[PDB]
Design a protein around this nucleic acid. Structure first.
Lengths: 198, 202, 156
RNA sequence: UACCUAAUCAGAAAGCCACGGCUAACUACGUGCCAGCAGCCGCGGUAAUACGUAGGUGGCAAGCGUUAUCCGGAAUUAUUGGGCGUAAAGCGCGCGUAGGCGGUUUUUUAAGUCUGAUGUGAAAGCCCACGGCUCAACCGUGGAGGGUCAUUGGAAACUGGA
């Protein structure tokens, strides 16, 4: 949806969490123009905007397309501060990042056709799938065994919580309740819980 | 800022001369042979650690002694170049009176060894201040003062001539017995002819 | 033991009788690694001896910044000079980023729940003076309870 | 003939902008107060990557620069948001009730602060949930439900007026 390089997400933002090594062959200093100079200090509203831009490259849906995402991480009752990390893992990228189909989120959004999609009935080729207690995000009859669906079947052993994945199946249908602290913590919570409100 | 540190009249009680010989008629001739033998030893020294010269040809004892810091391969593996130096000095005139050597205690006291570790990176137009801020502290550990980074123009890699004032320490010259090394040395590595205002002191 | 933040060492090209005198004004934040701001400027020839010079001559310009339950007690401002700041509360278990003004004010207050705010300009001489103006004008839980002189749960 | 995993022909996310910047952004030529650039800056009388072409870069999203219309900007007839002096502030008007307002003890018959008819308690109303249209308009819950519709008849030693 960004149609650009996916290597500037760990340079303009301060929370990428998409790859292990990225500053090994790059230059982990400051920005681009003044990359050989010193760094700065994120502003009050800037830190909440930097995280939004940091999640802008991470989340497939950008400004206006992620309406539900922001709407579910604000008005929704519960821990408003940690509502951006709780009610935001209901996408189709989580299933691919828990079964072993795509290591990135952008590739996980395009893995809703090449990889497992048939979630025990009606499927969805969007970046977010309605996986609830009863949906088994699996593959189709003709696309039972794919190349991107059965790529890292043995390379990705450790799986995440509230997710299921096996050999020649990769059907997620475990717990429906997820963790609100089972995600990277680099951005502020109350800051985004107030700024968004406005 | 022409601080040249008049050491000429400052020495003479501890620092005499490198060449010594009883003459007045053979003086110019002896001095002519001094530089004549210095045109072959300078190419054989290859910028060695030479503080002073022990050319004491007085009282019939002529000998062009060269310090050359610690005895390495300059004299040869077991004095193998000492026997080859005979013809070397025999080709010039007919001296070759067995030149001797001298063990220089505290080799890092001259401005040649300090310019071979901190001023050796200036040949490739590299560090000319960061490495020039070092060695003075090492010279202070030895017991002396050291050198003082200075320049009059062409500051490192730049087409615009710039000066400086990084004098880490002072230089005593109010006395008439003060001993100062002041070992000047420059190299023309495709950079052009230019003079520096570096200041040194024992 | 003490989180000293040496931002930069402002230099000066003195055009006096002398060729080019070099005066490095090493700038270092005099923080006590707790929640105080701290700011001191030196003027010695040796930055190391100049950084501690302002840390031993200016270490009482700090202000005690208490915390409620992991969130800024009050969103204060800063009206001292050009550069200004702002206190934005966040969750106790969070973090900070880079991009804006000074970073040695909320970083000293190990809480990871405050966002350092200071627009004004880039001049780091009138932007840190506004940060201490709001830090000293901060509103605490009991601090405001005494203002009314009743109960702590009667002024919220 | 929506989402659509299906036939699985090959039907194309480009773009325009700042680029020394302010403000996330550039290299060579060509210019050289000629022209360009041109909110803030300014850059043009020679070495303007600020100019115009090429290789570009930061942004964002099927596009991009423009014109008139609320609020971030910031309290700025100050209301939270004005002085009774340099600031934003000395009516020279010395003699007089604009009812705006300036101790009078005690003392009053109840100006009064918190109780009382409550049925009603509805609402393109923030409905505590409530239906789906993947990107769009698919609508029942009047008691809950606040957005009611018990706040004295009342307890006087008390703004200006004794």
């Amino acid at each position: 949806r960004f149609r650009g390089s996916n290597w500037k997400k760990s340079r303009r933002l301060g929370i990428s969490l998409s790859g292990t090594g990225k500053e090994l062959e790059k230059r982990p200093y400051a920005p681009g123009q003044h990359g050989p100079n010193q760094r700065k200090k994120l502003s009050e509203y800037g830190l909440q905007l930097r995280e939004k831009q940091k999640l802008r490259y991470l989340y497939g849906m950008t400004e206006r397309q992620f309406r539900n995402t922001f709407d579910i991480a604000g008005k929704k009752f519960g821990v408003h501060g940690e509502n951006f990390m709780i009610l935001l893992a209901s996408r189709l990228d989580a299933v691919v990042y828990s079964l072993g189909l795509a290591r990135t989120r952008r590739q996980a959004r395009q893995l809703v056709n090449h990889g497992h999609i048939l979630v025990d009935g009606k499927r969805v080729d969007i970046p977010s799938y309605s996986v609830k207690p009863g949906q088994t995000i699996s593959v189709r009859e003709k696309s039972q065994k794919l190349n991107i669906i059965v790529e890292s079947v043995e390379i990705n052993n450790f799986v995440p919580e509230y997710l299921n994945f096996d050999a020649d199946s990769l059907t997620g249908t475990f717990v429906r309740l997820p963790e609100r602290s089972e995600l990277p913590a680099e951005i502020n919570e109350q800051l985004i819980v107030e700024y968004y409100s406005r | 800022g022409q601080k040249i540190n008049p050491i000429g009249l400052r020495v003479g009680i501890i620092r005499d001369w490198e060449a010594k010989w009883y003459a007045e008629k053979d003086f110019a001739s002896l001095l002519h042979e001094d530089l004549k033998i210095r045109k072959f030893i300078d190419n054989e020294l290859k910028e060695a650690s030479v503080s002073h010269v022990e050319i004491e040809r007085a009282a019939n004892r002529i000998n062009i002694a060269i310090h050359t810091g610690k005895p390495g391969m300059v004299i040869g593996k077991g004095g193998s170049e000492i026997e080859k130096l005979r013809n070397k000095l025999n080709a010039l005139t007919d001296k070759k009176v067995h030149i001797n050597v001298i063990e220089i205690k505290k080799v890092d006291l001259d401005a040649r060894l300090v310019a071979e570790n901190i001023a050796r990176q200036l040949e490739n137009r590299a560090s000319f201040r960061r490495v020039q801020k070092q060695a003075i502290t090492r010279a202070m550990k030895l017991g002396a003062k050291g050198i003082k980074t200075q320049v009059s123009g062409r500051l490192g890699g730049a087409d615009i001539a710039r000066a400086e004032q990084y004098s880490e320490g002072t230089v005593p010259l109010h006395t008439l017995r003060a001993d100062i090394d002041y070992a000047h040395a420059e190299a023309d590595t495709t950079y052009g002819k230019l003079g520096v205002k570096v200041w040194i002191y024992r | 033991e003490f989180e000293e933040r040496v931002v930069t060492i402002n230099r000066v090209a003195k055009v006096v009788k002398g060729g080019r005198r070099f005066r490095f004004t090493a700038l270092v934040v005099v923080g006590d690694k707790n929640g105080r701001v701290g700011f001191g400027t030196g003027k010695a020839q040796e930055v190391p001896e100049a950084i501690k010079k302002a840390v031993e001559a200016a270490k009482k310009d700090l202000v005690v910044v208490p915390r409620v339950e992991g969130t800024t007690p009050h969103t204060i401002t800063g009206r001292y000079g050009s550069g200004s700041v702002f206190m934005k509360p966040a969750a106790p278990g969070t973090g900070v980023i880079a991009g804006g003004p000074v970073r040695a004010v909320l970083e000293l207050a190990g809480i990871t729940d405050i966002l350092s705010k200071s627009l004004g300009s880039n001049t780091p001489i009138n932007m840190v003076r506004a940060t201490i103006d709001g830090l000293q004008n901060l509103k605490n839980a009991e601090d405001v309870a005494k203002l009314r002189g009743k109960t702590v749960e009667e002024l919220y």
